[PDB]
């Protein structure tokens, strides 16, 4: 009911193409880590070029593409690659059941020092709270200045969005991870299938 | 000893910095059409009798 | 004179503050200018260059502009 | 324009990164930014209040306006690219089927 089958086999009249721009340090990393991305995108059937003059990634559908979702996967892939995620993580968003999201978190806090405190609180001591959030939601979270990048499945995306909202609204991430652990236990045992779970939080 | 090694690393950093300053001044100034004065020449400011 | 330029500046910021009446940074700067004016005027009273009864709160301002 | 069409033009311009530079940030001071926007408003108004709507869109297709903006603003600060990102016709006051079939 939830499983996505791999596309087995010209579905594009107008040769579609997407573009994104990036700065110079990203140009250095993208140039010495590009051939992985272009091998995987050629396997899916999408021609991808990088321009170190202008600083622009371009993806475009070739003649031999058949998977039509591949161009949108390519668009989100190159958006994240400009947004400085690691390249193996980008090739993992090239999977079928994967999806990204960005959370703008600068608007939700007014005071500068309070926002810095809450962002470091979301990241946690030694990265422990972050990696434990990644564990309990099966996602990958990257606190990126004013925005928070996240990749994973859709249920986990909703959970991570909720947790980021509550941590910015000053509900502590330790409280949130305790909530998530208890919810995980109630997901394990099946005799508690459909009741109001609020009696345990 | 530690003080001498520390201060000589700082001395190398300062001398390399001054050399890069003089190098950029040569490359971007009108002094480009001259020969680099040797340092054994640069040691004596003036001689008089 | 230094005191003349300072009281002219105080007159200017006071006229603007009377027209607007909402900001507070203008009030803070007017306070600082009034303090500087009072210290300098005190020094000038001590050196004796002006009459010791010369005072400015607002009527000296209105008379010097009128 | 000449045909009593009131319209709004929203133009967007990105700052040029000059070749042979080492400084990573190509920031312009706020005085330069306001002067560049003033020149942009001047150029757009001067090349949009002289012509008709058909001439305006015959200008909009090959992007002459961004080219002239770049050509006239590169002296105050070079611009990487100048596009006209929106063109909204607000009010049309006439129904001239003569001019309409003249287009068609």
């Amino acid at each position: 009911k939830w499983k996505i089958e791999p596309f087995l086999p010209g579905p594009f009249l107008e040769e579609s193409s997407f573009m994104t721009l990036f700065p110079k340090y990203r140009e250095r990393y993208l140039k010495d880590c590009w051939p992985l991305v272009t091998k995987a995108l050629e396997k899916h059937g999408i021609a991808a070029t990088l321009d170190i003059v202008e600083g622009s990634m371009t993806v475009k559908t070739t003649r031999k593409t058949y998977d039509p979702a591949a161009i949108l996967k390519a668009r989100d892939l190159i958006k994240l690659l400009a947004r400085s995620v690691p390249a193996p993580q980008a090739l993992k968003i090239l999977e079928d059941g994967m999806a990204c999201d960005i959370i703008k978190i600068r608007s939700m806090v007014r005071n500068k020092e309070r926002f810095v405190k809450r962002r470091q609180r979301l990241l946690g001591q030694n990265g422990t709270t972050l990696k434990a959030l990644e564990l309990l939601t099966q996602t990958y979270i990257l606190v990126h200045g004013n925005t928070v990048s996240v990749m994973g499945g859709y249920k986990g995306l909703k959970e991570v969005r909720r947790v980021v909202e509550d941590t910015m609204n000053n509900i502590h991430p330790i409280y949130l991870i305790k909530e998530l652990m208890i919810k995980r236990e109630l997901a394990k045992d099946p005799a508690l299938a459909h009741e109001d779970w609020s009696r345990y939080l | 000893p530690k003080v001498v090694k520390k201060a000589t690393e700082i001395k190398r950093e300062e001398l390399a910095a001054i050399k890069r300053r003089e190098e950029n001044e040569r490359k971007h100034s009108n002094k480009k059409y001259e020969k680099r004065k040797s340092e054994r020449e640069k040691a004596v400011l003036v001689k008089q009798q | 004179e230094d005191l003349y330029f300072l009281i002219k500046k105080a007159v200017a910021v006071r006229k603007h503050l009377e027209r607007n009446r909402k900001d507070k940074d203008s009030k803070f700067r007017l306070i600082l200018i009034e303090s500087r004016i009072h210290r300098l005027a005190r020094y000038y009273k001590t050196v004796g260059v002006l009459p010791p009864t010369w005072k400015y709160e607002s009527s000296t301002a209105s008379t010097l502009v009128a | 324009t000449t045909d009593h069409y009131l319209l709004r033009l929203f133009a967007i311009a990105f700052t040029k990164r000059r070749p042979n530079q080492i400084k990573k940030t190509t920031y312009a001071q706020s005085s330069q930014i306001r002067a560049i926007r003033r020149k942009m408003v001047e150029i757009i108004q001067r090349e949009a209040a002289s012509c008709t709507l058909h001439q305006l869109v015959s200008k909009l297709i090959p992007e002459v306006i961004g080219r002239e903006i770049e050509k006239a603003t590169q002296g105050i600060y070079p611009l990487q690219n100048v596009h006209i990102r929106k063109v909204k016709l607000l009010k049309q006051p006439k129904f001239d089927l003569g001019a309409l079939m003249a287009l068609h």
């Binding site: 009911k1 939830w2 499983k3 996505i4 596309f7 579905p11 594009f12 009249l13 107008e14 579609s16 998977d67 039509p68 979702a69 161009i71 949108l72 996967k73 668009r75 079928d96 059941g97 999806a99 990204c100 999201d101 960005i102 608007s107 859709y154 995306l157 909703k158 969005r161 | - | - | -």
Partner: protein, 115 residues
């Protein structure tokens, strides 16, 4: 060939395959995922969008337009601004069961400053 434009409104909760003419006003056919799957939990499934796209493509080829411009969107006001598994699997099922695809555009409403 006649291009019809399909709005795929793919939330996290439900999926909307919507087919209109180039105006966007004249609705040809719409099929959601909730009207094809019984479970509200499974309402947003790639299976739901697969069945929805099969129904929609069957309808629009029985009309005979066989070519679609695709506009995908998501909940954009205070939501996530990213489409759904409905969107991906629906596009896949569509161009598998026919439907020469023209221009793809991800037209989501992005607020300048919301709250």
């Amino acid at each position: 060939l006649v291009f019809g434009v399909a709005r795929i409104f793919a939330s996290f909760n439900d999926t909307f395959v919507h087919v209109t003419d180039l105006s966007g006003r004249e609705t040809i056919c719409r099929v959601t995922g909730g009207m094809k799957v019984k479970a509200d939990r499974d309402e947003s499934s790639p299976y739901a969008a697969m069945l929805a796209a099969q129904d929609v493509a069957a309808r629009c080829k029985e009309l005979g337009i066989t070519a679609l411009h695709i506009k995908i969107r998501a909940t954009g006001g205070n939501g996530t601004k990213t489409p759904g598994p409905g969107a991906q699997s629906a596009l896949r099922a569509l161009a598998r069961s026919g439907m020469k695809i023209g221009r793809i555009e991800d037209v989501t409403p992005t607020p300048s400053d919301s709250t």
